[PDB]
Amino acid sequence: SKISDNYSSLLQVSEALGRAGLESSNLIVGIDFTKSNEWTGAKSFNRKSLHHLSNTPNPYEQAITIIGRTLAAFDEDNLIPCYGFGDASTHDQDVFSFYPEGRFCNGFEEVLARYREIVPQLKLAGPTSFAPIIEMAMTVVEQSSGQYHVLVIIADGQVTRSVDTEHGRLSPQEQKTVDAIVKASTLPLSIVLVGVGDGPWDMMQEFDDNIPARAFDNFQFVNFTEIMSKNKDQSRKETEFALSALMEIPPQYKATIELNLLGVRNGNIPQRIPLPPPVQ
Ligand SMILES: [Ca+2]
Numbered sequence: 001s002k003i004s005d006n007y008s009s010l011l012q013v014s015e016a017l018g019r020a021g022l023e024s025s026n027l028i029v030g031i032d033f034t035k036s037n038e039w040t041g042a043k044s045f046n047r048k049s050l051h052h053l054s055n056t057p058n059p060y061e062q063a064i065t066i067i068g069r070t071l072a073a074f075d076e077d078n079l080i081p082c083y084g085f086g087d088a089s090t091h092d093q094d095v096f097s098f099y100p101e102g103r104f105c106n107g108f109e110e111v112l113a114r115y116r117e118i119v120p121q122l123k124l125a126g127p128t129s130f131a132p133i134i135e136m137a138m139t140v141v142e143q144s145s146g147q148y149h150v151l152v153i154i155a156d157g158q159v160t161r162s163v164d165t166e167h168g169r170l171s172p173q174e175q176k177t178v179d180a181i182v183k184a185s186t187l188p189l190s191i192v193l194v195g196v197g198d199g200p201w202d203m204m205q206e207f208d209d210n211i212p213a214r215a216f217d218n219f220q221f222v223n224f225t226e227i228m229s230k231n232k233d234q235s236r237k238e239t240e241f242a243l244s245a246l247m248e249i250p251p252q253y254k255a256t257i258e259l260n261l262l263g264v265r266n267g268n269i270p271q272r273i274p275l276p277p278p279v280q
């Protein structure tokens with residue numbers, strides 16, 4: 001069933017996790033390197049590309065940074081597998097690992113550094129689909145034998161569609177993304193979409209709230225731009241981010257126990273191989 005916003009403060013989330021008795025969790029990060037990032041910073045990033053490097057941190061650097069300051073404790077060994085998708089080497093079919101032999105980033109400081117080192121070497125492309133990043137996460141979970149994971153996807157939310165959809169019919173990219181979300185729910189995996197840039201966010205909100213075929217609500221949408229836009233203190237910004245990102249985690253974690261997913265091998269999860277980073 002659909003999971004609502006049941007907590008009005010970070011403290012309530014923490015207590016809910018306390019009651020549920022969470023003992024162990026790990027993070028997975030996926031980063032959208034599709035071409036739409038060049039134009040979804042029109043209003044929110046002064047007509048620059050969301051991936052543009054300079055003296056000001058771009059929204060991806062900001063999200064990675066805030067994620068590291070607020071969610072780091074939810075990765076138990078501070079080793080974070082990072083993947084990119086949607087550049088010219090992966091299109092809508094594959095992901096690549098941040099490092100050549102699948103070596104994990106040691107801390108989000110290194111996630112941020114490696115991001116900076118990689119992104120100007122990429123050809124931003126497409127089409128845009130979340131199926132490969134989610135399928136990657138599924139393989140990480142299956143290979144750990146059903147250890148609980150949270151996949152954090154940082155993206156601009158522009159999954160490929162036709163503007164004159166006729167009407168409510170999904171693109172292949174949307175349909176494959178939905179199928180991946182539905183299949184993911186046979187595994188102990190939480191997904192958090194951190195939306196950067198201008199939106200629009202209709203489809204992310206649909207992933208969040210309305211996929212009847214899945215076994216539990218396994219997908220939360222965080223509007224990162226709207227949180228950072230609020231004329232409000234920086235510590236209150238990060239607290240509001242943490243709250244939004246963790247909002248569904250206590251019920252999702254509980255669902256993995258009640259649906260007998262936690263610690264169990266599914267047996268029907270194809271092994272996705274990440275491509276090497278297309279870099280020097
Ligand atoms: Ca880890």
Ligand SMILES: [Ca+2]
Binds near residue numbers: 218219
């Ligand atoms: Ca949801």
Ligand SMILES: [Ca+2]
Binds near residue numbers: 219248
């Ligand atoms: Ca939600």
Ligand SMILES: [Mg+2]
Binds near residue numbers: 036127128
């Ligand atoms: Mg795109």
